[PDB]
Design a protein around this nucleic acid. Sequence first.
RNA 1: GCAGAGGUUCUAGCUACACCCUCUAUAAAAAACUAAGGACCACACGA
DNA 2: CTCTGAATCTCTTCCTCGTGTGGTCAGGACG
DNA 3: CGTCCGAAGAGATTCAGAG
Lengths: 1337, 99, 79
Amino acid sequence: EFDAIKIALASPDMIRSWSFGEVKKPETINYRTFKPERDGLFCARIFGPVKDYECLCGKYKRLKHRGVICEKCGVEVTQTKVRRERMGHIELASPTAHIWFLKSLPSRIGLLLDMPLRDIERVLYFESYVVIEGGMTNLERQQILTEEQYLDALEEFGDEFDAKMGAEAIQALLKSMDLEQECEQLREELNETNSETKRKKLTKRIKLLEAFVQSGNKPEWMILTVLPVLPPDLRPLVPLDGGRFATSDLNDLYRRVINRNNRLKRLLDLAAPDIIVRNEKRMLQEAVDALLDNGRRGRAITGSNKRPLKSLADMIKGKQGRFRQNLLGKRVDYSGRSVITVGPYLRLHQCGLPKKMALELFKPFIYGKLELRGLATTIKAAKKMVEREEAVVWDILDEVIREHPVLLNRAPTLHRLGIQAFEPVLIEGKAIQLHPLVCAAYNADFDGDQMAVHVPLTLEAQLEARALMMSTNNILSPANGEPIIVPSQDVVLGLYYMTRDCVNAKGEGMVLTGPKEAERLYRSGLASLHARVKVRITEYEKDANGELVAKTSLKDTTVGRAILWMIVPKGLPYSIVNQALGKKAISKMLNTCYRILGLKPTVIFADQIMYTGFAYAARSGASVGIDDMVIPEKKHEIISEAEAEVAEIQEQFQSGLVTAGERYNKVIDIWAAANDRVSKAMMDNLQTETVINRDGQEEKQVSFNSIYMMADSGARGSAAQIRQLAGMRGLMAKPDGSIIETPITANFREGLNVLQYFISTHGARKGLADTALKTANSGYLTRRLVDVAQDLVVTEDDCGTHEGIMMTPVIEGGDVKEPLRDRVLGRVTAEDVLKPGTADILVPRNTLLHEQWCDLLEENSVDAVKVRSVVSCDTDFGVCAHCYGRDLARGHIINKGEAIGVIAAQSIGEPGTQLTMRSSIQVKNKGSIKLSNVKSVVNSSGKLVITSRNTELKLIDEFGRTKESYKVPYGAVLAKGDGEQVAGGETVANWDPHTMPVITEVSGFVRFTDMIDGQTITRQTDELTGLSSLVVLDSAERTAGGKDLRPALKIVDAQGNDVLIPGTDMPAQYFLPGKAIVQLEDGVQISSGDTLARIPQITGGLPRVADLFEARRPKEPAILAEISGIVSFGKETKGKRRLVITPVDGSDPYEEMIPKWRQLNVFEGERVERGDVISDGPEAPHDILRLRGVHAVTRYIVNEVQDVYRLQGVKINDKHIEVIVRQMLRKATIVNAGSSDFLEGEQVEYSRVKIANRELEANGKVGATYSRDLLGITKASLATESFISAASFQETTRVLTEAAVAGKRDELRGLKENVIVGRLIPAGTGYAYHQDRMRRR
Amino acid sequence: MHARSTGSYSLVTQQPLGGKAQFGGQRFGEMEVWALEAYGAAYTLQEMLTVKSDDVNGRTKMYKNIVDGNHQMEPGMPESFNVLLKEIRSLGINIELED
Amino acid sequence: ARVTVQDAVEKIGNRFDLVLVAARRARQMQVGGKDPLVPEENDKTTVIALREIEEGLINNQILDVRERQEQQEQEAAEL
RNA sequence: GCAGAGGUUCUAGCUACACCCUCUAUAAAAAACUAAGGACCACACGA
DNA sequence: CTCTGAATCTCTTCCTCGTGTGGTCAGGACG
DNA sequence: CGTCCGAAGAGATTCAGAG
Ligand SMILES: NCc1c[nH]c2nc(N)[nH]c(=O)c12
Ligand SMILES: [Mg+2]
């Protein structure tokens, strides 16, 4: 029907048009006859009939009389449902202003009149006088006058001077104001203004004026003169508890307003004193304010146990209004809820469902089939048959349940795997059974967790809950390409116990025929599960294309492994089931089955694995006993020796040899060493303790300890948890964070002392308290991420662009964190990437990199592959298929339609729950070294001291792969030449980290250029170097003359002949910074590299991710250069230290006011380039974006987010972060308007400006120059072009007001705006329908 | 355990009041809506937002269809959206469904 | 009873379209009087439609052609 | 309810989306048709 | 000497479902 | 029988002092 929703400003004529009556009386109902009031809020002739097809006076309710108006009562016989559609209006005696526009973020009416909000607040509430239509007198139109001042002015001149008071004054002012004349005047003043301070207000005011003149709105419509009322049904007033009949917060406010209006009318007609009339006007204005938005002025109308009343505005915003509680999260029918149970007998695609629950979930189907089969005739008879629970009913239910999937759903469904389809299997209990394997994707738990059962109804729903959501089709997680069905606890223990070996068990050396004989031998009892034998096994290999070749051979393996071979399908080889088969082994087995074979055999393999694991874990009888926890025997000796060391350290502290901090550190270190030794001893006494008689001398074997079996396999429990049970607990921490000196030297098997238990309670309470708020923080972050990327659907196929990000292996400096074989797989090449061999095109321009293609790049050792990224796509309103890459959950190219916004938002939101809420550069291997931007100058000593301060040490091996990367600061002493094969384990650059030496670029003589001694040069006796050194004090440390004479070191000769830097005619000058120990006194020969000076020198949890995604500025942003120019101190740090950075040819003297306390890393004579750190600190994302580019910001934010996530262990593909980054930088500010209609200061959507530029470039016109902007996710989502999606996120009132003023029209097309409307979302199976609808239009 | 196929409607006309004491339906919260949107789910979202919760001309139609044999659906428009439209219109802001 | 629909999605890579093209077949077998082209193995209409799609008997083009033939027959019936 | 009227029953039952039957002045012979009020606040608990 | 960067002042937001318990209001004469 | 009677950041602001 409708194609778009349009918002605007309501006119009094329109308000009267909506109204179907005129509410006058401040009553609701009669508490005797309980009938609609004559002219009250609950009326009948004004709004509609109370009972269907019946009049109030109960006269001719024929029902054939509809559209007839009974004159006895005054109502028209119609349907009752018309009482929730028709509205009424109240005629205000005096004009009243709308609080939503008066008191908001920009103060709409204040901005329009260019008057401070305080004066408007005063005059609106009848306090002060604004004199409209000033005239020839002293005061003007917009002058503000005091009460006594108003009286004096009136007594002075009684001319057209009109000092009005109340909202009538504002109405008259708005009416008198001519928008067009103000428009041109404001534009002229904007041209006149030179700076941007006044320009900001000018632009805002001109934008408001243009918005008012564009849309069909009037500036005087904001002052309400006719107040509409909600339809009566919408405000119920029908509790009917003990006859109370009185529960409407809204109704009370309406009665207040009506009573005030009636009293004002009575006083006005009675010609009451002006003060009384004004007081009643104030009361009316306050009542209207409370009715619209209660609590905005500062006071709150209340009285119900002193609780604020719920106004109309409170019923729209917040988490309880009809925008996030009843429009998004609609409660549904055909639903259930119960507790979970294991039920291992189930297959993978089905689940348990209680009979009593199913008989109520599927009642309509039962009615239908009962009527069809003739068992019952009427719906009442079928109802009775159902309630009687007759035997026939169950048989019918077994037919309507055969292939009817249900959507089992947990409460905190973070990722898409939360709600999964399942075929029902009817059971007799009272709990929905869940297949054990799918208890991991759900995050399902069996400590009383509750699930919800929904029932798809339509044929499309039943087909979809079979081909899109069934548990069999969800094998790979959407975020990371890893299996989601992983054997967790019991099956892995059973398989581990099954596939092991004992050095001497019954039935050793026997030559078994086959797996059948192995099973027969184990079941009979003539042999044991784990005993090395020789059994022939037929291994099927699919090396031939689609052909299974049989290879029968006598492989040496145990009985248990041979039994498991039957479960394994044909295609897989035998080496998978010959190992110990822990947990990673089982996961890899499942993954290899999914790779070599199809999805169809994988499900059966998983089910058989689970069955066999359960059976052979039950047969094992693996139990934990006190005797199993073996305490290492050397524990007491280790503890005694550690205590002796502690006593020795205390003795040294008493003698004064060491300090308190040194003593503390030494005690901590020795206790940590003791803990390490205890853990090592415990492990050595548990892992291989068993010694068994191998037909002769005893032989050591991997132990069969139940704890060790539960820890080595991976069922439940890591090595640290085993350590806490036999070894010492460790050094526990104090609440603040300090490590307590005395560690807990008692395990859990032994007794724990009272003090030790208290120290443990510290950490336990800290952890629990952290999790309690971790949950909420993760929830909020996930909600923001979902709302920022809701409208991203892959519409087009190929973007056709030629740009893309450059993916390279990331090396922090120690090792390669992520190889290129993982950041490129699943992505499409941006261009023709070629192998290191020149003119050798290895990979074509546009090819999806499958596993084989990635292997080819690794074989040729390519370490730089250009990859198309979703931030480089050009298709407007949705990314293309090729730019995105692989589905990451299916293995093929992404199908047109799959919503990649919600998927990525959930993928970045789900791991957030487990994320915590709170020198000598060495070399690893042998290879060549590289140095970029190197200022190499060899000193007299013969060392490679480099003036360059932002250069790096990239060690490249013989194969070209970058093994490691480092950084060397100003004047770094090197040890190896650039491009020279270095040795192993040596220090490439052994510079002193503390000092900051200022070396000589050129040799010669020293001249004190602007360094008169005493002020900046201070040759105090330096006993550190054995000679008085001319230490340059800090910029503020030195005297005023020191700042006046900026420390600079010129190069001269014996006769003061200035020697220039080779390349530039100007003499070489070294502008030394503060705290610089200059050694060479004036008139001393220097070497080309001799060190002159010497300067001895954030959270990473969920808040870090939130700050990264919200683009929050750090505490001390890194001051970077806005242009490439020579630095020069503007002044002597007088208040704000200036820095004149002007280019060589460029004349622009960009000046930045750097605070004095901020450390200035730059010199006073260097030449920084655009994007060079001047003040050390965190780099703000906005500066990175505006300086380097969008690709650089993307590479920064993705890398930082991945670094935060990689620490805990979770893995997320980078494209999920990249789509969020793309959704962030959707806005672009216009720099040059060109020939388009865009203004200068205007945040226009990037897609719109790109479309306009393309249209202009198609013909002979110029486009428009823009500048990309990076907003936070909480701000970019709030600045969309739709007023019904932004109003669903935050600050509903502000968004609604801004939309209403501008008269915007949302064209839907989103993925949430259609959820609100209630039609097909244009993402999933509704994409075809929506594109057909667009085709029709 | 609590399963209800149908029950008395609320003031907003949403059929599930909620809870066990008064026959109610489990809330399909925003999180579950996002989880459905992640899949190709589009028809089940419509049938869980319009014809299952609040559509006075849709629920009865679908009940009659179900008890007759064909599992079709008439989309309609949620009653809560009309309630929202009336609430905003009563605020002095004119919002309309343009065609 | 179709457990996995991988064989069915071989016909329609989009997968969203596969649901749309099977809904038409399921409605034709449920509402309309059209007999299934595959041996009815005591399965509901949805599974029958999916199985028919797997064998290559039902797709968008074949179903549209059958609808066109029905339209031509209706034209002949109405003279 | 063919229109008006009455209606078996299986609350109530020409509208709630409704629907059907027989009958000619007014009720009485008969089967098939469908789901009604929920305003706010504190406290406790589970995954 | 007028707007730099630097305070200053109000404003909005803070998981997601269940299981439940208890307490619950405008304003009483009046002609 | 009515009828009257902490927090954490962001916006949204000034204040300003130097070059
Ligand atoms: N709702 C109509 C109605 C009331 N009583 C009825 N009795 C019968 N036999 N048939 C009906 O249709 C009705
Ligand atoms: Mg649990």
